[PDB]
Amino acid sequence: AIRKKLVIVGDGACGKTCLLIVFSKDQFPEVYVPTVFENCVADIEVDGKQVELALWDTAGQEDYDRLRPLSYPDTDVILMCFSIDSPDSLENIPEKWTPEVKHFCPNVPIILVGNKKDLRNDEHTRRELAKMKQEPVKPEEGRDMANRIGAFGYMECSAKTKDGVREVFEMATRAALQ
Numbered sequence: 001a002i003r004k005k006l007v008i009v010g011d012g013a014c015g016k017t018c019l020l021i022v023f024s025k026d027q028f029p030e031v032y033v034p035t036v037f038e039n040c041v042a043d044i045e046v047d048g049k050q051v052e053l054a055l056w057d058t059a060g061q062e063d064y065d066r067l068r069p070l071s072y073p074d075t076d077v078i079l080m081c082f083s084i085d086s087p088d089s090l091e092n093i094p095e096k097w098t099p100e101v102k103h104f105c106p107n108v109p110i111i112l113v114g115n116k117k118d119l120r121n122d123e124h125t126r127r128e129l130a131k132m133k134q135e136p137v138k139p140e141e142g143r144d145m146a147n148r149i150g151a152f153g154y155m156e157c158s159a160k161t162k163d164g165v166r167e168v169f170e171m172a173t174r175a176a177l178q
């Protein structure tokens with residue numbers, strides 16, 4: 001089987017760890033871990049080809065800025081995440097994550113991922129965002145950002161409902177196979 005390394009990055013609490021676990025274990029996590037720490041290699045088939053996907057979780061907090069580059073060597077595809085309930089995490093795509101990622105992984109394909117799609121129409125989410133004069137990220141905002149950073153594609157998903165999750169990792173696999 002083809003062996004590809006995947007690294008997921010994005011702001012603290014935007015759903016990275018839950019996405020890896022929903023995809024690799026088909027279950028939304030109960031217990032809390034900052035990063036998936038036990039082995040995390042998932043299988044996927046794309047156009048007849050069997051692909052082995054090593055999932056490298058990272059921490060989004062600035063506390064971990066010193067150590068996160070230790071995960072970047074030999075990366076084949078990057079999942080760059082924001083949360084649809086957080087326009088701030090989108091604005092950190094060009095201001096924080098693309099600079100860091102493209103510095104250590106200069107030509108590694110990027111899939112831009114908007115997590116927590118199930119909160120786009122969530123009442124508490126919109127009330128929280130409205131009090132800051134904000135609304136959830138619209139799909140055209142994610143597309144525009146993806147074009148702007150040169151991502152191979154833009155995908156939306158919800159780890160909670162699993163909607164879009166498999167597609168995210170299929171798209172990432174296609175990018176890495178290039």
Ligand SMILES: Nc1nc2c(ncn2[C@@H]2O[C@H](COP(=O)(O)OP(=O)(O)NP(=O)(O)O)[C@@H](O)[C@H]2O)c(=O)[nH]1
Binds near residue numbers: 014018019058061115
């Ligand atoms: N509604 C909703 N909540 C989600 C979804 N994915 C994750 N969450 C929730 O969002 C919170 C953060 O998720 P988590 O995966 O820990 O985020 P992270 O990006 O890995 N955080 P960190 O960088 O600190 O490790 C948790 O409370 C989790 O249950 C989703 O698709 N929908």
Ligand SMILES: [Mg+2]
Binds near residue numbers: 035
């Ligand atoms: Mg995490």
